[PDB]
Amino acid sequence: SEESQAFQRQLTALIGYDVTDVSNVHDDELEFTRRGLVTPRMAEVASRDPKLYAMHPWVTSKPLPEYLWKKIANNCIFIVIHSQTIKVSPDDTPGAILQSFFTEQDFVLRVCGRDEYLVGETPIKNFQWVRHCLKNGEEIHVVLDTPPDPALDEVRKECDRKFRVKIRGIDIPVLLTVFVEANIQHGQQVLCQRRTSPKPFTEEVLWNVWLEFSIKIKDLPKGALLNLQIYCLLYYVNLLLIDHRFLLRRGEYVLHMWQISFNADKLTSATNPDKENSMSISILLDNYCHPIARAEMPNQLRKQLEAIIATDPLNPLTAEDKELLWHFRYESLKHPKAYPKLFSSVKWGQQEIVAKTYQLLARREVWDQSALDVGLTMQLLDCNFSDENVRAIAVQKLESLEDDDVLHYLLQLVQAVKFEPYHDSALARFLLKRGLRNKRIGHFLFWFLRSEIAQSRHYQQRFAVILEAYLRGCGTAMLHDFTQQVQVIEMLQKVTLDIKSLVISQLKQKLENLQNSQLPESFRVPYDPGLKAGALAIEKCKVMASKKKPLWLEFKCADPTALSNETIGIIFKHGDDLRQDMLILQILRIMESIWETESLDLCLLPYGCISTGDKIGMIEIVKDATTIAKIQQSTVGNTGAFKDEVLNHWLKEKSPTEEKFQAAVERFVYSCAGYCVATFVLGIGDRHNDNIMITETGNLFHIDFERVPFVLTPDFLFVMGTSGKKTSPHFQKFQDICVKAYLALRHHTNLLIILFSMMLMTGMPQLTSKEDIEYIRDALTVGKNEEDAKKYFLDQIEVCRDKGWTVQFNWF
Ligand SMILES: O=C1NC(=O)/C(=C/c2ccc3c(c2)OC(F)(F)O3)S1
């Protein structure tokens, strides 16, 4: 169409990148992938009931946790249907709740303020909103609303020769000894390895040398990088030996490399988009090779095996371990927790060994019959595995996750796509399907993919191709929403940057001029999709106090049925890599969920945090909170240290009645406990102060994501009810929690270890493929007993009490 490229313009703008360019590719994997993604899309758009879709019910299946049952150990729940109030049972479908208020079905129980319909054949107690209400001890509130017109959700239609490589040379516009080290990799595991003679290092360098590897053209497994690096390690680049059609790479190539400043960036098929000042490498791949496509173990070794298949995912495998693990393939193949180690003990450098492997996978029943382990399913999707079949079973076990869990793991999964050898993968296609199936999962997919496309040259093209596929299947409604969301931010970030260049005088001046006619009618809060936003309470927008000059904006709720005058806060900031916070906040919701399995609870406060571009993004404003210092600053501050009894007064003072003060201290121990266990494990316990806040309601929470395990300042202890070497009745509950929460995590050592490791490889700069990760093994005290550890954390608890303020004063 001569108007079709206008839609594409719509996409391009939503995406933030152009999946139509081609000045930075050397094949058609991206295109072929766009072409290939159409089937997965249709297969989903089509297989999706327009009814429940357009309404996106949000339910769970996990058993209702104790703490929330206790708050209703009387089997009774009232649902105020807009003001005739009803009382339902923890087992009544939205219909039963419709039976009452009514005694034609063109009505649906929507929620006041948000976009959260309590529709669908689901048990009342199985609605996230309902449980949220139970959590916040609030009261449910619906509204006789007419079910949404899905029409708006219509998707606009449409040889045995040894491998050799020729290294011509490297060119750079503007820059000693330097060599090129080609490496035939697979699973981030080097195989062969050939180099070059250390010639001079200048703007141009010709070697014209063929590099004859040992691996035979056959031995080459699909998904084996041709890693080219330059040493004097300054620049690197990769090439997929076998391309997306199983064919083998053959030809002349001129690759533009990435410069170094371990991590997931070093894995990419993408070349540098900046051919203006980036290093170049010339290589030649000329050829005419063409593509392709019992008994009983003893009794002492089996023990050796079970021992191995029982250690953490970190524990390295000795050459001995491996040879053993593979010789007993069919036994190791019985224990699922053995897959990772087992498939990491395969020699992909041998068509024959690999051959067996594949024929070994067809014999997997115990696996596809065993209980789904996310921590184990995740280990199979990391950097250590580059084989389609290996990774596919893992993706097959994920296909079982209900939405609630596909959201609890979305970010980490979307980040895992950086470990996929090719753009079209079961994982991407999996993300794609669940995106289109549920609008909630789709909304976050959108922003998770966008954050990367906006700052990852390394992974933007591939991500830009997975989003496009999504933006063309979600419906016309959403596409409008995303357009409105993207506008607001692109604008608001401009304001943010300006006000940083230097205030409150030109602040509202610029703000006010913004609402004028730019700021849309009502936009969706990117971190909480079920909340619209209108004009800004300009008279409330400011600029926080700090070297960083974040923007404290507050909007009004564009909703009438909303039973409150409450505002929608939003903190925009430039200067921090909010992509490390998102990941850390994600891990937090995971522990905030693990604990639930054991009905435990720590009242964590993971606020919304959505990256948006380079060193910038949005943050959620947590109502009625204050930074730990601002409290100990009104009284002291400046050059003065702190006050022991300041914080405790801040609670009783900042809380009416006595029925509110103790609560404010009750929910203060759990929260204190929660962030101590959490940060301790996450290895980020040594935090200053302005980086730690608490609510007038008692909930404390960290922010901005000679030593100590964590911050439990005497104040916290004070509030608990202890001056020092003692033990208040609450300090006990504190411990009665911590250990019960800390040991509840050890129950997932493997999971926390696989996420931690993945977080570092795709969230931080360069990553210590060794240490930095082993830190979590230590913290969780892997291997020891349900006691040595319990004491371990306690000794930690001590050091924090033993040091009073040793660092709080230092932090300079
Ligand atoms: O400059 C900053 N960099 C960050 O990462 C910040 C985090 C933060 C998150 C939630 C909050 C908050 C602050 O104060 C609040 F009460 F608004 O609730 S502030």
Swiss-Prot record:
Domain PIK helical: 294-473
Tissue: Pancreas, skeletal muscle, liver and heart.
Presence of the UniProt keyword Hydrolase in the record: no
Name of the top EC class for this enzyme: transferase
Record carries keyword Nucleotide-binding: yes
Compartments where located: Cytoplasm; Cell membrane
Binding, ATP: 569-578, 604-612
Positions of the C2 PI3K-type domain: 159-286
Domain PI3K-RBD: 74-146
Pfam families assigned: PI3_PI4_kinase, PI3K_C2, PI3K_rbd, PI3Ka, PIK3CG_ABD
PI3K/PI4K catalytic domain location: 537-805
GO molecular function: 1-phosphatidylinositol-3-kinase activity; 1-phosphatidylinositol-4,5-bisphosphate 3-kinase activity; 1-phosphatidylinositol-4-phosphate 3-kinase activity; ATP binding; ephrin receptor binding; identical protein binding; protein kinase activity; protein serine kinase activity
SUPFAM superfamilies cross-referenced by the UniProt entry: ARM repeat, C2 domain (Calcium/lipid-binding domain, CaLB), Protein kinase-like (PK-like), Ubiquitin-like
Substrates-to-products reaction catalysed: a 1,2-diacyl-sn-glycero-3-phospho-(1D-myo-inositol) + ATP = a 1,2-diacyl-sn-glycero-3-phospho-(1D-myo-inositol-3-phosphate) + ADP + H(+); a 1,2-diacyl-sn-glycero-3-phospho-(1D-myo-inositol-4,5-bisphosphate) + ATP = a 1,2-diacyl-sn-glycero-3-phospho-(1D-myo-inositol-3,4,5-trisphosphate) + ADP + H(+); a 1,2-diacyl-sn-glycero-3-phospho-(1D-myo-inositol 4-phosphate) + ATP = a 1,2-diacyl-sn-glycero-3-phospho-(1D-myo-inositol-3,4-bisphosphate) + ADP + H(+); L-seryl-[protein] + ATP = O-phospho-L-seryl-[protein] + ADP + H(+)
GO cellular component, one term: membrane
Effect the entry attributes to changing N810S: In IMD97; loss-of-function variant unable to rescue reduced T-cell activation when expressed in Jurkat PIK3CG-deficient cells
GO BP: adaptive immune response; angiogenesis; cell migration; cellular response to cAMP; dendritic cell chemotaxis; endocytosis; G protein-coupled receptor signaling pathway; hepatocyte apoptotic process
EC numbers: 2.7.1.137, 2.7.1.153, 2.7.1.154, 2.7.11.1
Disorder this protein is connected to according to its UniProt record: Immunodeficiency 97 with autoinflammation: An autosomal recessive disorder with variable features. Affected individuals have childhood-onset antibody defects, cytopenias, and T lymphocytic pneumonitis and colitis. Some patients may have features of hemophagocytic lymphohistiocytosis.
UniProt family annotation: Belongs to the PI3/PI4-kinase family.
The protein's name in its UniProt record: Phosphatidylinositol 4,5-bisphosphate 3-kinase catalytic subunit gamma isoform
Organism field: Homo sapiens
Gene this protein is translated from: PIK3CG
